[PDB]
Amino acid sequence: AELTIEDALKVVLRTSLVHDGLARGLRESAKALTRGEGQLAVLVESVTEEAISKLVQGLATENNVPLIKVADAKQLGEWAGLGKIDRDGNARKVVGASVVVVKNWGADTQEREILLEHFSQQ
Amino acid sequence: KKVYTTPKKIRHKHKKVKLAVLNYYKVDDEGKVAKLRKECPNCGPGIFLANHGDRFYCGKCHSTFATQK
Ligand SMILES: [Mg+2]
Ligand SMILES: [Zn+2]
Numbered sequence: 001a002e003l004t005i006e007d008a009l010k011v012v013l014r015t016s017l018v019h020d021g022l023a024r025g026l027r028e029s030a031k032a033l034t035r036g037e038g039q040l041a042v043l044v045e046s047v048t049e050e051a052i053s054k055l056v057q058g059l060a061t062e063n064n065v066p067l068i069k070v071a072d073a074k075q076l077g078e079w080a081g082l083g084k085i086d087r088d089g090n091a092r093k094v095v096g097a098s099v100v101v102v103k104n105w106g107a108d109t110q111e112r113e114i115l116l117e118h119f120s121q122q
Numbered sequence: 123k124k125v126y127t128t129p130k131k132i133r134h135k136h137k138k139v140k141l142a143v144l145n146y147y148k149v150d151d152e153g154k155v156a157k158l159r160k161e162c163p164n165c166g167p168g169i170f171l172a173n174h175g176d177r178f179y180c181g182k183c184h185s186t187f188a189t190q191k
Contacts, residue, residue, distance in 0.1 A: 026144050034167035055147055058155030 008111050009070060012040075013080035015106020022080065022100060026052055029101040033059045040102035040116065042076065043069045056099055066120040073098050146170055160191065 016022045023032040032038025041060040047053040060067045070076060073096040077083065080100065083092030105113070148156045159170040164183050171178045171187055179185045 030144070030147075031168035037168075051149065052144065054149045055144060055155065058149050058153060061153055062155050 004111055004115060006070065008113075008115055009042075009068065010079050011110070012102065012106060012112050012116075013076075013100070015112070016102050016104060017081045019104050019106050021102060021104030021106065023103060024082075024097055024100055026056065026099050029056065029099045030059055032101040032103060033063060036063060038101035038103045039064065039066060039105070040100075041065070041067045042100035042102075043067060044099060045069060045072045046074075052099075066116050068116065068119060072096075076100060162187070 013022065023029050023038050029038065029041070033041075041056065043056050043060070044053045057067075074094060077095045077097035078090065078092065080097060082095045082097050086092040146157075146159045148158055150156065157167070157170070159173050160178070161167045162169040162171050162180050162183065164180065164187065169180065169182045171180055176190050178187050178189060178191060180187050
């Protein structure tokens with residue numbers, strides 16, 4: 001694929017990190033949501049508890065839903081910003097990020113957000 | 123220098139005691155997301171007051187709420 005292969009999301013995450021806006025964890029996500037501080041929602045896939053996932057979904061529904069699920073949590077952790085620096089080519093301490101909610105957005109325009117918008121408004 | 127005597131007590135701090143995290147919420151019949159514990163009147167939903175035996179203090183306000191409910 002010449003266009004976006006799930007890496008628009010990654011880009012967005014990176015931008016957020018740069019400008020300080022990633023609400024990581026469940027509680028943080030909830031906080032972001034209930035006040036209207038955070039906008040985007042990344043949902044858990046490898047949920048052995050599932051209750052947490054359900055809660056997240058509910059939260060997303062409650063105010064505004066530009067929801068996305070991606071692929072697990074470990075991957076997210078690896079990508080966005082978890083596991084200590086380690087050289088240029090990954091090989092970090094492999095750690096999961098659980099849940100992500102985006103504040104600030106980050107950069108301007110791009111193929112960053114169009115997909116998200118499409119997902120949301122139907 | 124003087125011989126060190128020491129009159130007992132080798133104290134420590136609160137090491138948090140990490141309980142459950144999301145226990146102040148309920149999700150029921152698919153889609154619904156119902157709230158447990160009273161939300162803070164100082165700063166809205168997200169921060170909810172601690173409910174004890176007529177003790178109603180906060181966390182972002184750290185302590186500043188005491189009134190009966
Ligand atoms: Mg002494
Ligand atoms: Zn508070």
